[PDB]
Design an enzyme around this catalytic site. Structure first.
Site, PDB file in Angstrom:
ATOM      1  N   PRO A 139       0.803  -1.228   0.000  1.00 16.67           N
ATOM      2  CA  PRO A 139       0.000   0.000   0.000  1.00 16.67           C
ATOM      3  C   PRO A 139       0.835   1.277   0.000  1.00 16.67           C
ATOM      4  O   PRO A 139       2.031   1.236   0.296  1.00 16.67           O
ATOM      5  CB  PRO A 139      -0.805  -0.109   1.300  1.00 16.67           C
ATOM      6  CG  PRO A 139      -0.919  -1.565   1.541  1.00 16.67           C
ATOM      7  CD  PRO A 139       0.381  -2.153   1.067  1.00 16.67           C
TER       8      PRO A 139
ATOM      9  N   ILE B  32      -4.010  -2.847  -3.146  1.00 16.01           N
ATOM     10  CA  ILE B  32      -4.569  -3.983  -3.881  1.00 16.01           C
ATOM     11  C   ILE B  32      -5.460  -4.753  -2.903  1.00 16.01           C
ATOM     12  O   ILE B  32      -4.977  -5.504  -2.047  1.00 16.01           O
ATOM     13  CB  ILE B  32      -3.472  -4.873  -4.479  1.00 16.01           C
ATOM     14  CG1 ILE B  32      -2.603  -4.084  -5.463  1.00 16.01           C
ATOM     15  CG2 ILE B  32      -4.085  -6.076  -5.192  1.00 16.01           C
ATOM     16  CD1 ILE B  32      -1.334  -4.825  -5.889  1.00 16.01           C
TER      17      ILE B  32
END
Ligand SMILES: O=C(O)Cn1ccc2ccc(-c3cn(-c4ccc(O)c(F)c4)nn3)nc2c1=O
Lengths: 114, 114, 114
Positions: B1, B64
């Site tokens: 992230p 994701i």
């Protein structure tokens, strides 16, 4: 197309020709004329990667088309190689967000490309 | 992230261990390994919120997966809390845009995550 | 809504009131009250457009709704017009990316808008 690099590498370590080098390499990579490529480099940033403050980069590439699974794997090799040689950034400390933009959502010259 | 904060708060008001704290809190909130969490703070910005130049922030979180209705409410409480405690920014002067990225659209170390 | 402009124009060339004008014009253009408009101006950037370092700008507009074909052409005319008149940037050296945000993906005041 539009390519942005944010990095904690200091300003004096960004070579003077880096923006033109990126412009030319991305024009070949994407198959679009260099006149359409824009590039933006932001040094001296306060950032960390995996909790470490060693040199790193956070990037993004926007384009109307020419974005996809196989193409993005190729772009990552091209861009990691450039950041490694010119900015001395290790390639496992590079993130690149890819964006496939709709022509109606890109403004330019008082209108959009739709 | 990847998490980014842009704010008009001065550089001197950013606490020394702030990047470390963001990294650890985001790892516990997302369940992602801290080795793959990147954080980026940009102070001294020229900004306005509701027409006022009082302290404010514009932020983004890319990931994701782990992005959704309830998860984003929990992230927002956590992140506004940290911005209020550490940077003294009122939570009603903070926006956070959340992005659920496709694994093929995130480049890392000469490839993508697909 | 959130409007961001990054430019290589120097900070001293941004006129007094520029962020107030953007707030008022975007409130009228999007139909949202000015309390919810945020604006962010980043001058003195290292960037190039088409391999040239003449004045240019890279921008984004995020909004929950009010994003679309004809609307985005109208935003582009308004915003290129302001950048040309106030910052002396030619409209053919401006890119604006438009994002239609889902309410569940926008954090504010410790929660999200949905
Ligand atoms: C525990 C399982 N596991 C293992 C490895 C692993 C490795 C990487 C990631 C990962 C990286 N991003 C990311 C980074 C930057 C961006 O800009 C972005 F959009 C996304 N999102 N997830 N996740 C994982 C992961 O969940």
């Amino acid at each position: 197309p539009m390519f942005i690099v944010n990095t904690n590498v200091p300003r004096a370590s960004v070579p003077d020709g880096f923006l033109s080098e990126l412009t030319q390499q991305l024009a070949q990579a994407t198959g679009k004329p260099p006149q359409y490529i824009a590039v933006h480099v932001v040094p001296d940033q306060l950032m960390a990667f995996g909790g470490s403050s060693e040199p790193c980069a956070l990037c993004s590439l926007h384009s109307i088309g020419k974005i996809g699974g196989a193409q993005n794997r190729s772009y990552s090799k091209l861009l990691c190689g450039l950041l490694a040689e010119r900015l001395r950034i290790s390639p496992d400390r590079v993130y690149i967000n890819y964006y496939d933009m709709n022509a109606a959502n890109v403004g330019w010259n008082n209108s959009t490309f739709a």
